[PDB]
């Protein structure tokens, strides 16, 4: 039972209980007024101030209002600014502040709250774990790694710290090293470890080192509801979408797009080659640690449904052609990009992040031998001026062992069963 009342708040516990009763009975408007009255009457009261914040929080949920929730976030801070705040209340108030900041996407704000929490409570390992998450959410992997190293130095069997440390190691390409942390962390069963991200990356790391137990973890991640299937391991999904590794144009319904790509393929090719020849810096190396070896770069025209204007200067006719197809130019969970791969390249088996897109590949310069792509259990080759269509949320793998370069054009489309409102509302990836 948390101790939320300081000495003075115990003397007004009756008033505080009455207001909290209104709030828990669901009479949130009355509760807000009751706690506002307690705050004006007892301006230093931490329990009254916390009640005001919790009422605003509840109101925000009732109205699904981010504005009301921002109000609550400020009142939770006010609580911590008052005199003589009981430790349990201080911790609850600032924790909920950080949690609602994260819910709103204020990740830098959440991080600052979490840093303050760890200063105020230096022996709370769970708060350190939460701080590490804060760092991860702003992209500060170096500081996250230090936090989890500290956690493990004091509580070496903490499963949450183990899985997050392994995640960080894996992301740094420390594949072998990451495996024991990911595995031990998932096996710990500790809260926060039963997370698709850790199954996904444990299996990927094992595949990379040749350890055959990878699909054991894929099956268990499936059994625990993280993956639609053992083959399809995307983690940002709309459930229910038709799932198959390979699609025909008519199955997708995007027949006009496929026809435009194939009928105009030489123009698309020639713009890509001109960029290779005189603007090669527009092609950026693949930067998601997906390769075993080899050279692979991409020249991106659209990402997250936004045209790259400078890029489109390099492929102006191709970009004009594509503007007629919002199913791709507005695909905020895919890209439109040229992709060049050179001999000696092997892309590790891997999965895209979302089942909400399908990926078209138009062949532009395809050596007669040496290039192929596997998706799930079917392996195919490209052809110049022909489109292949696969669902990259299924595990897929690519090889380039020709004697010259291989150029394709990649056009992501919205999964065809997604409705217009889904296409408008789904968070971009």
């Amino acid at each position: 039972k948390p101790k939320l009342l300081n000495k003075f708040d115990k003397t007004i516990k009756a008033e505080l209980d009455a207001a909290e009763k209104l709030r828990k009975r669901g009479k949130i408007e009355e509760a807000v007024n009751a706690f506002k009255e307690l705050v004006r009457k007892y301006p230093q009261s931490p329990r009254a101030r916390y009640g005001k914040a919790q009422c605003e929080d509840d109101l925000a949920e009732k109205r699904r209002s981010n504005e009301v929730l921002r109000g609550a976030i400020e009142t939770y801070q006010e609580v911590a600014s008052l005199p003589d705040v009981p430790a349990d209340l201080l911790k609850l108030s600032l924790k909920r502040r950080s949690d609602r900041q994260q819910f709103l996407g204020h990740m830098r704000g959440s991080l600052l709250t979490l840093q303050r929490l760890v200063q105020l409570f230096p022996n709370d390992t769970s708060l350190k774990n939460d701080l590490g998450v804060g760092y991860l959410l702003i992209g500060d992997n170096d500081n996250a790694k230090k936090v989890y190293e500290e956690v493990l130095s004091v509580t070496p069997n903490d499963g949450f710290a183990k899985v997050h440390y392994g995640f960080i190691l894996k992301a740094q390409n420390k594949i072998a090293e990451s495996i024991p942390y990911l595995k031990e962390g998932i096996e710990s069963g500790d809260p926060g470890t039963d997370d698709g991200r850790f199954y996904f990356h444990l299996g990927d790391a094992m595949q990379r080192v040749g350890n055959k137990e990878a699909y054991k973890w894929y099956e268990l991640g499936h059994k625990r509801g993280h993956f639609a299937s053992v083959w399809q391991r995307s983690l940002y999904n709309v459930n229910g979408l038709k799932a198959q590794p390979w699609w025909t144009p008519k199955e997708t319904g995007y027949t006009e797009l496929v026809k435009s790509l194939e009928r105009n393929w030489k123009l698309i090719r020639d713009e890509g080659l001109a960029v290779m020849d005189k603007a090669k810096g527009l092609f950026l190396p693949e930067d998601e640690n997906l390769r075993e070896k080899g050279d692979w770069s991409q020249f991106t025209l659209w990402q997250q449904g936004r045209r790259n204007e400078n890029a489109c200067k390099g492929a102006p006719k191709t970009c004009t052609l594509l503007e007629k197809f919002p199913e791709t130019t507005g695909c905020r969970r895919g890209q439109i990009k040229y992709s060049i791969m050179h001999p000696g390249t092997h892309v590790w088996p891997a999965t895209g992040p979302t089942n909400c897109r399908l990926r078209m590949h138009l062949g532009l310069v395809i050596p007669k031998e040496g290039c192929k792509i596997r998706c799930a259990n079917e392996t195919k080759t490209w052809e110049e001026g022909k489109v292949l269509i696969f669902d990259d949320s299924f595990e897929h793998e690519v090889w380039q062992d020709a004697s010259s370069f291989r150029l394709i054009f990649i056009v992501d489309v919205w999964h065809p069963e997604l409705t217009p409102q889904q296409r408008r509302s789904l968070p971009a990836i």
Partner: peptide, 20 residues
Amino acid sequence: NQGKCKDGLGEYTCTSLEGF
């Protein structure tokens, strides 16, 4: 996460949250 999940799933989170 200051990096995006384009082809893979390598970031801790792939989306930016917007509340309700």
